Structure 1
Amino acid sequence: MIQTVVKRDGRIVGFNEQKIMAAIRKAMLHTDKGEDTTLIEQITDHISYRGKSQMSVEAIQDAIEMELMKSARKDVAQKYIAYRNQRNIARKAKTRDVFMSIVDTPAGMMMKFASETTKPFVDDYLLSEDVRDAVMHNYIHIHDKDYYPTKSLTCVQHPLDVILNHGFTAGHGSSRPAKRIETAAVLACISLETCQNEMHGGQAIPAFDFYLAPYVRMSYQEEVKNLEKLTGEDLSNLYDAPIDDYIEKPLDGLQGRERLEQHAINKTVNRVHQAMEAFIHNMNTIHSRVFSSINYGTDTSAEGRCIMREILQSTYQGVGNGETAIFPIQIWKKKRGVNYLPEDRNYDLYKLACKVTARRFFPNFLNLDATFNQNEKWRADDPERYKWEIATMGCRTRVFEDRWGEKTSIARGNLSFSTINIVKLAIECMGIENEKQRIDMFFAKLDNILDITAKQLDERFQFQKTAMAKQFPLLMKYLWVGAENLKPEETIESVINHGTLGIGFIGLAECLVALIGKHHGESEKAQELGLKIITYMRDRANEFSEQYHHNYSILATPAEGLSGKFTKKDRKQFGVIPGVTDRDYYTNSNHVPVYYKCTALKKAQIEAPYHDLTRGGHIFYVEINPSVIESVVDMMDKYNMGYGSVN
């Protein structure tokens, strides 16, 4: 018969026939009709005989189920199997993640639960038939689909002046306008964190130096007032006294009323340094607990320069014990006539920026001299000229133009963006040996996929309106264009049509190899064909914008949540192809593949003429001494490069 049973943990025990009987009985006492031991005895006798003298618990339960689903009582088997499976799932939850398979920080687990429970229901009940079929067959990717039922937007550029000047009331929390540098930075961090919860993208602050400039003078005035209180003097003429720069100088060797004109500047510099050092640590820890971007560089004043040189020296020492800071993402705004040439006003700040980018990976560089960035309403004497300087985010997104409004990049943002796979569009028509027919079929299918993605974006726009203003407290009261005439229970459809709808692509080297012998980085004809298809998409986007009364733009997708979710589903359907579906990850939107070795000059020369057709966003990533960064910035200046992120 059977002598020994091995438990699950590993213990060895003697065979006990009164254990199978009591287990079958508890499955017979949960059905419509129970039974006495008439069949239990037969099952146990059959199991005990025909054994191996040593059996496991699972090896006995398998036999129990096999016997139960074989003798006239198939209703006890289906109660036995389900209970066994539930107990197995319960025991597998002590060291694994079974609950995610059925459908580490607790907040992350809850967010994953929400995303997984939301995605399929949106995929089924909200999308139309044609768009659903297009999405199913690995054609188009709808970014942040989990947040679809929450009629949410992507990002916005914060007009920090409103908050800093009038105060903000969000819920039961109200805050007055600031009066020094130790509160303006905190209020900026509060605004970023608050608006992050209301949108599924990043947060950016344009004109970082301009907004905080007025709060460097206030600290100086407070220090002067406190300095004249213990001496009984009268320093009323120093309040509006112009200052060349807030440079710290040693105090020894002076006396009188010119010695205390420097103590105030010294302590003002110290306070501004501490404030800018707290900003970085806060925006790093909050993310490590939020996509944050700050752009600055086009201010010429003693206060803006002080802020720009304190931030650029607190980002040099790093965080903690010298560690580099991942956030916030810092961007330098370079213009011809402000801080570029050696004789311009802020050349030393530019030199410091180039030095810091060689140790701490930041800042980036945004070129204001490009054709698509220049604005005609700019004059370097208006104190509010920052409204006409373009700003970008760390997520590679641009919103400058507008067909029914001003050409500004403040208080505007993205509404939605979707990505179109074109490598499959090339493999699906790789069979043809004649080039002309192959290209014609490629274009014919590209037209249809573009129409489908435009219809999907229009439908998502139609769903995103009908959202009450109260659902977004901070965004639709202080941080959007017309968000000052909207009642709490009023639809935002009267101001929603000021954002950007993005159409992106992933992979162009692969498409050309699946089309012609090589990619754009080796063959000129492939480069011409790629430029042609990009221009065709841009013209179709213009037609869509004219037809649907919206704004459409072409984007180079950042490839942060779509790096791999396009090539596995093509390997499983088309097989391994040399140089196309044999690398793991597709190459980026229009870059140069990381394996085709090139120099910076050739890469820049080939990749430059795409930025004029990628108005929705583009990057110039170069892998690698301040001289190297200076050369990179000069190379960007020589061409129409819009955004660069050399490290």
Structure 2
Amino acid sequence: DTPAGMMMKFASETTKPFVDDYLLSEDVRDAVMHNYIHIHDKDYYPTKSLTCVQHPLDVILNHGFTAGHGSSRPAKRIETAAVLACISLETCQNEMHGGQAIPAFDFYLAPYVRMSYQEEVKNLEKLTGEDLSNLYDAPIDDYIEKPLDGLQGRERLEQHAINKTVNRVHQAMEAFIHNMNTIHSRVFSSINYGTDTSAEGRCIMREILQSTYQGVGNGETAIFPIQIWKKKRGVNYLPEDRNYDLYKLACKVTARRFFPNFLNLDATFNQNEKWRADDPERYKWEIATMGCRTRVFEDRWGEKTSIARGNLSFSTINIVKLAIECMGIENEKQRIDMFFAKLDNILDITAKQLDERFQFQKTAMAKQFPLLMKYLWVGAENLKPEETIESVINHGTLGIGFIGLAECLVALIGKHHGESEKAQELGLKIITYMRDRANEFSEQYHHNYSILATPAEGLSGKFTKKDRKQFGVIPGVTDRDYYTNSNHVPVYYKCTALKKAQIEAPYHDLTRGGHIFYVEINPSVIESVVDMMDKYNMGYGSVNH
């Protein structure tokens, strides 16, 4: 109970009551206290703050940032480039109410391994006068480390120059892990890597994979940052691929430290038509994600990219409450036919909730978000510091959620989708109907809408605690607490690894906002999980304990 916690707690409790009675609609706020819709991050509504963003780190490292009275200059070393990444992540956090992500962590910091190598290559000609003017552009397969025991030539001062760069990058990544793990006040951070096939890129991947195995402190396991591995055929999946070595190392780390996660880049819906293996800027047309299971890929009025975009707001739905309210009728054809009428009126209600906040997030000032509306958003750099930022906000995304499929799969047929085949077919109808209605609203409201599988990181037992107080204790529904996740097989049901994958697989295509796959337990038991993610279309996956 620090003073910082007691200050934000007061702020949170004095802002939500004002939001409900002065900033919402009588039609929408009616369902926000009736166990139908949960408006995420309601305490930050009066501040016109967006949720999360993928940082375009190339615009800050090349030309410095000038926020407030603090002015910086272009970086020239690995040490100063890694720190500026933390500064950007810790500064934009005070302007947005969600998480911060770095897409293409390998791509972004790759050039500054080269610059730090040229600095050493001219601090060794000072002691030893030599015209070493060719190591600037010398191709290097990778930067490796080995004993300097036996060498009597230029290589002994060449391999040593590589030898001291890895440690100067080794400490730079160890400081990155500790610095993002020391939350003093009261910071959610995520990094994705794996798709860069160069010497500079591969140096970053190994040196942060070996610092998440030793741990923080006296051997403790770190919690932040959240690390994600990007898997693509032809690069790092098959044994013949270039980065197969670094794929078989991340599975060893996950067997003792439970990181990183795995992102399936084939996925039949993560593909793009302007991705080439020879493009220096090919990282634009690749999917990146955060630890909150958020996807921002497509665009109805722009190019298909994820950099410099993000989420604006999202809300969660209670599909269990509708199903429980539909009991009593005997015939099964009418209970199911009444469920979809109770879902149409809440999807339309949710859609107006997002639009009413889109207008409020408009008419803002670019100076309310320093370092965001000047360097981080797509349409910035074309606005005076006060000119009503409106022509850059249309590229964001809006989300609609749901929770508790298994419980609503036992309120109409009696058995959930882990012990019945009739229960699995009805599960794809209660989801594919929601996906279709998002396209109608996006054309109607002139925006981007999507369907989300909510992480339930702040909604663990809010719905079931109040559902018990209304209807009672119903066997199999309100008798366990802790509603199951989006569509997962219940944790109290004995199921094998394979049978769990065949059931949760089809739903990932329908939900374009986010999804995950969880397995609870040698690295062989970890690679077999990733194999299940290729035999079917998965997208995201995680193994923990």
Whole-angstrom distance in 1 between the partners of 2:531 and 2:457: 29
Alignment partner, residue 66 of structure 2: 169
Residue 416 of structure 1 deviates from its aligned partner by 0.4
Instruction: Please give the per-residue CA displacement for 1:321-380, whole angstroms capped at 9, x wherever unaligned.
Output: 111110000111111011111121111111111111111111110011111101111110
**Contact 2:230–2:264 (CA under 8 A) maintained in structure 1:** yes
Whole-angstrom distance in 2 between the partners of 1:422 and 1:164: 46
1:643 matched to 2:540:
yes
Residue 258 of structure 1 deviates from its aligned partner by 2.1
Distance 1:122 1:281, change over 3 A: same
Instruction: Please give the per-residue CA displacement for 1:41-65, whole angstroms capped at 9, x wherever unaligned.
Output: xxxxxxxxxxxxxxxxxxxxxxxxx
Residue 496 of structure 1 deviates from its aligned partner by 0.7
Instruction: Please give the per-residue CA displacement for 1:184-226, whole angstroms capped at 9, x wherever unaligned.
Output: 1100000000011111100000000111111111111111100
Alignment partner, residue 285 of structure 1: 182
1:354 matched to 2:264:
no
Instruction: Please give the per-residue CA displacement for 1:496-521, whole angstroms capped at 9, x wherever unaligned.
Output: 11111110001000001011111122
Question: Secondary structure at 1:339's aligned position in 2?
Answer: coil
Question: Secondary structure at 2:210's aligned position in 1?
Answer: helix
**Contact 1:141–1:418 (CA under 8 A) maintained in structure 2:** yes
**Contact 1:195–1:475 (CA under 8 A) maintained in structure 2:** yes
Instruction: Please give the per-residue CA displacement for 1:264-286, whole angstroms capped at 9, x wherever unaligned.
Output: 01111110101111100001013
Whole-angstrom distance in 2 between the partners of 1:287 and 1:402: 38
Instruction: Please give the per-residue CA displacement for 1:70-105, whole angstroms capped at 9, x wherever unaligned.
Output: xxxxxxxxxxxxxxxxxxxxxxxxxxxxxxxxxx11
Alignment partner, residue 463 of structure 2: 566
The structure that is helix-richer by fraction is 1
Whole-angstrom distance in 2 between the partners of 1:178 and 1:625: 42
Whole-angstrom distance in 1 between the partners of 2:16 and 2:186: 25
Question: Secondary structure at 1:128's aligned position in 2?
Answer: coil
**Contact 1:247–1:265 (CA under 8 A) maintained in structure 2:** yes
Distance 1:237 1:298, change over 3 A: same
Whole-angstrom distance in 1 between the partners of 2:16 and 2:185: 26
Between Structure 1 and Structure 2, whose CA radius of gyration is higher?
Answer: 1
Instruction: Please give the per-residue CA displacement for 1:252-309, whole angstroms capped at 9, x wherever unaligned.
Output: 2111222111110111111010111110000101367611000010011111111111
Instruction: State the Cα RMSD in Å.
Output: 1.1
Whole-angstrom distance in 2 between the partners of 1:311 and 1:425: 47
Whole-angstrom distance in 1 between the partners of 2:186 and 2:115: 33
**Contact 2:40–2:315 (CA under 8 A) maintained in structure 1:** yes
**Contact 2:4–2:185 (CA under 8 A) maintained in structure 1:** no
Question: Secondary structure at 2:129's aligned position in 1?
Answer: coil
Q: How does 1:337-486 map to 2 (within 5 A)?
A: 337-486=234-383
**Contact 2:319–2:408 (CA under 8 A) maintained in structure 1:** yes
Alignment partner, residue 107 of structure 1: 4
Instruction: Please give the per-residue CA displacement for 1:509-544, whole angstroms capped at 9, x wherever unaligned.
Output: 000101111112221222111211111111111111
**Contact 2:2–2:186 (CA under 8 A) maintained in structure 1:** no
Question: Secondary structure at 2:247's aligned position in 1?
Answer: helix
Whole-angstrom distance in 1 between the partners of 2:108 and 2:276: 18
Residue 638 of structure 1 deviates from its aligned partner by 1.2
Residue 153 of structure 1 deviates from its aligned partner by 0.7
**Contact 1:287–1:327 (CA under 8 A) maintained in structure 2:** no
- Higher relative contact order, structure no. (Cα contacts within 8 Å, ≥ 6 residues apart): 2
User: 4+ residue stretches of structure 1 with deviation over 4 A?
Assistant: none
Whole-angstrom distance in 2 between the partners of 1:286 and 1:168: 24
Residue 599 of structure 1 deviates from its aligned partner by 1.1
**Contact 2:229–2:262 (CA under 8 A) maintained in structure 1:** yes
Instruction: Please give the per-residue CA displacement for 1:373-418, whole angstroms capped at 9, x wherever unaligned.
Output: 0111111011111111110001111111111111101111000000
With the length of structure 1 as denominator, give the TM-score of the two structures. 0.83
Distance 1:287 1:360, change over 3 A: farther
How many matched pairs? 544
Instruction: Please give the per-residue CA displacement for 1:568-619, whole angstroms capped at 9, x wherever unaligned.
Output: 1111110110011111111111111111111111111100000001000111
Question: Secondary structure at 2:393's aligned position in 1?
Answer: coil
Residue 136 of structure 1 deviates from its aligned partner by 2.1
For structure 2, which runs of at least 5 residues remain unmatched after alignment?
none
1:217 matched to 2:217:
no
Whole-angstrom distance in 2 between the partners of 1:618 and 1:283: 25
Residue 628 of structure 1 deviates from its aligned partner by 1.1
**Contact 1:600–1:622 (CA under 8 A) maintained in structure 2:** yes
**Contact 1:520–1:527 (CA under 8 A) maintained in structure 2:** yes
Question: Secondary structure at 1:222's aligned position in 2?
Answer: helix
Distance 1:407 1:464, change over 3 A: same
Residue 249 of structure 1 deviates from its aligned partner by 2.0
Whole-angstrom distance in 1 between the partners of 2:183 and 2:272: 36
1:499 matched to 2:407:
no
